[PDB]
Structure formats: C-alpha cells, structure tokens
Write a protein that binds this ligand. Structure first.
Ligand code: MAN
Ligand code: CA
Ligand code: CA
Length: 410
C-alpha cells in the first residue's frame, strides 16, 4: 500500500497527493481550455466526461479545502465554478442544452450550496455569489412548468421537452431539488424552501421510488405508465442524497418524522451498499466493464455526504463513521497501480487494483472518489455546515427570475 491513513497527519498528506493526482486530469485552467469541465464530452470525442462531472469535481475540491485547510486549488475551483454559471447565473449555460437535466444543473447548484456552507471564499463583488447561485438553481427547479400533473407531480429527468428522457421522472432529479431545498431552508431559515422539500420527499415516497418496507431507493419510472414501471436499479448516490437532505430537514425542523426517515434510509444504505464495510455500486460493480463514467463517481459522494450527516444528525455518528473508515481503507489499499505505484481504481471491495481502462475512461471518477473518501476521514475535525448566522455568502431575492431566463421562453 502506498497511502497511509492512520493519523491525522498521514491522512492530510494522502489527501494532498490524491488532490494532486485528481487535478492532473483537469486542464480547464490552462490556456485555450474551458474552465470547470473535465475532458469531454464523449459525444464530441473530446474525452470521457460530461459537464455535470465537472460540477461534481468542483464540489469535491470545496470539501477538500474545508476538510484539510489546504487552499492550493481554491483559485482554480472558483474560476471553474464561475465559468459555468450561464448568462442568467442559474447553471443553465445554453451551449450545454443537450446535457441539461435537472440532475446536471442540480449538481452544480449543490456545489454552490456547499461553497456557501463551507465559507468558501466569495467571488468578486460583480460576480454571482454562492448562495445566490444555489437559490437560482432551486428557483428554476421550482418553476411551475417543471411540475405538471403526470404521476401527480415530480420533476422530469430532463429540462428541455425535446431531450430524450423527458418522459422519465427519476429519483436523482427530485433528490437534487429536495436536497437543495432542505439545505437552503437550514442556511436561510426560510420555510418556503422546507415546504417544497417536504412536498418532493412525500412525492418520492408516494410514487414508490422509496420502498415503503425496506427503504431501498429505486431509480425512476415513466410518465406514460403513471410512473408505475419502476426501474429498481439501486444507485448509491440516490439513497445517500435522500439521506443527506433528510438529515438537513431533521436538523432544521426537529420533527421526529425526519429523524425516522434518516434512520430508515441509513439502515437501508448500510444493508444494501456496504459489503463487509466497503461501499459497492450494486447495479454495476459486480463485474468489470459495466459501470459508466457517471457511476464511477457515486461512491465518493456517498462518503462526503454521509460524513456531513454525522455533523448535522449527530446521533448517526457511530453508525456511519466506522463504516466510512473501513470503506476508505479499502479505497487506499487498491491505489497501487502502475505507472506511479499509487494509481487508483474502482473495485475497492475486491481488494485489488483494476486499470480504469476496463471501464473505458482515463480514471478521473475513481480518483475523485478516493479523494472524497480520504478527505472525509477528517470530518471529526471540521466545522459543520454554516448557516446565515456565520456564513459569508450573499443571496439574491430574484435568483432564477430574470426576464431572459429560460423559463420565460419554455
Ligand atoms: O448513472 C445512473 C443514472 O443514469 C441516468 O442519469 C438516469 O437513468 C438516472 O436515473 C440514473 O440514476
Ligand atoms: Ca444529463
Ligand atoms: Ca472513453
């Protein structure tokens, strides 16, 4: 094994080297390149990765600085986050319409929310501020044309009605909107965010994407079947994101129903995704060559989001932290690949390095996931998410409401 994680100082050093190796994939700060994106998209044969994964990377580094105190990459991350905001400061840049799902926009909004929660340095005064960007994403996702009567509500996966997949009302789109609403409620103390989060969670429960008996979290269903054709694939990020949002709602509301939802979602996650203490991407990891570029990132979110749950729902700490520890130990045990002696693969539970080429990418998602898992071992030393009591960001009461906003020509 190359990386050591047995003391705070060892973890910090390992995380620093992991942050270096992940950054080698990113070219957006170099002359002639586009800030905020990993190489791609694959539809243009420019690389393996889609736009939303750039937003996931940005948030990973906002958390990296929060967890380690190392600000080395903060300027690069601010540049990337600001470049992708779009003309209406809502994470809907039109050049990316083909990638404009509610999930894709949501991941960028969640990185902005994280920047506000983590007191990440503010953009210049003339540029959109982190809380305002999160508010803009949430507001566009709450807009009435995104909430029709099919399946008695819920967001569709896609934003443009002509995009393939507009007929799929899926967990991830709704989970992003739910999580943002819960987090905006806690930060701002505005109850309209919370009422929307409650409504969307109740919809996810009613439609049966949350199993009423087992608290498994399924993938979605299609409007032409009234959402009854449930795709029962269980992706780790879906259950983990609902757990994260539920923990914010428990912290904000102190309503026992939210504590019960945290506990039930957590029981399900530990049962389904942790195998002898190691996170496992059940729909695809059982054999090599099946996980997509997107899926290689999910286990990193699981680690980072579950670590935050222990801060805002502290009664969960002893159920979560020991399991994140065994999972991160498995992550580092397999970061031994050539040519560096420390290259990271995906198949942590297996105990062996597998070249990312088996899954047809250069390996950025695997690197991101290990960075997330190792950094998050420092959660016990980190501050909890800030609210507006101590945060430094600024909001915008008209976030998402510009006259040139896309909702005005839907
Ligand atoms: O990567 C898994 C992910 O794939 C697509 O985005 C959709 O099918 C989602 O519903 C699913 O969660
Ligand atoms: Ca998309
Ligand atoms: Ca490829």
């Amino acid at each position: 094994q190359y990386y050591k994680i047995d003391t705070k100082e060892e973890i910090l050093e390992s995380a620093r080297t992991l942050a270096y190796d992940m950054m080698l994939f990113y070219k957006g700060n170099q002359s002639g390149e586009i800030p905020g994106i990993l190489p791609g998209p694959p539809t243009e044969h420019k690389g393996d990765y889609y736009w939303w994964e750039g937003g996931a990377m940005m948030g990973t580094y906002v958390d990296y600085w929060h967890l380690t105190g190392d600000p080395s990459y903060n300027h690069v991350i601010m540049e990337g986050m600001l470049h992708q905001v779009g003309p209406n400061a809502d994470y809907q840049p039109p050049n990316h319409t083909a990638s404009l799902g509610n999930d894709d926009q949501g991941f960028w909004g969640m990185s902005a929310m994280l920047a506000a929660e983590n007191k990440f340095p503010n953009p210049p005064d003339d540029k959109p501020q982190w809380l305002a960007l999160a508010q803009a994403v949430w507001t566009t996702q709450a807009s009435p044309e995104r909430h029709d009567g099919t399946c008695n509500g819920g967001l569709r996966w896609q934003i443009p009605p002509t995009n393939a997949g507009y007929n799929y009302k899926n967990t991830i789109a709704n989970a992003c909107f739910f999580d943002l609403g819960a987090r905006l409620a806690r930060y701002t103390k505005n109850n309209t965010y919370a009422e929307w989060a409650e409504k969307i969670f109740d919809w996810l429960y009613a439609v049966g994407y949350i199993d009423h008996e087992t608290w498994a979290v399924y993938d979605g269903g299609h409007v032409e079947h009234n959402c009854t054709d449930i795709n029962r694939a269980q992706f780790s990020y879906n259950a983990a994101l609902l757990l994260h949002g539920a923990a914010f709602m428990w912290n904000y509301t102190e309503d026992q129903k939210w504590k019960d939802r945290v506990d039930n979602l957590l029981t399900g996650i530990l049962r389904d995704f942790f195998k002898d203490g190691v996170v496992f991407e059940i729909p695809c990891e059982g054999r090599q060559g099946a996980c997509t570029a997107d899926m290689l990132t999910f286990k990193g979110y699981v680690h980072r989001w579950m670590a935050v749950v222990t801060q805002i729902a502290p009664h969960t700490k002893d159920r979560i932290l020991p399991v994140l520890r065994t999972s991160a130990e498995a992550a580092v045990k397999q970061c031994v690949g050539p040519p560096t002696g420390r290259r990271c693969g995906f198949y942590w539970k297996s105990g062996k390095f597998v070249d990312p080429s088996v899954d047809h990418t250069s390996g950025a998602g695997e690197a991101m996931s290990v960075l997330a898992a190792v950094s998050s071992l420092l959660i016990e030393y980190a501050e909890p998410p800030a609210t507006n009591e101590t945060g430094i960001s600024r909001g915008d009461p008209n976030a998402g409401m510009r006259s040139r906003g896309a909702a005005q020509h839907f």
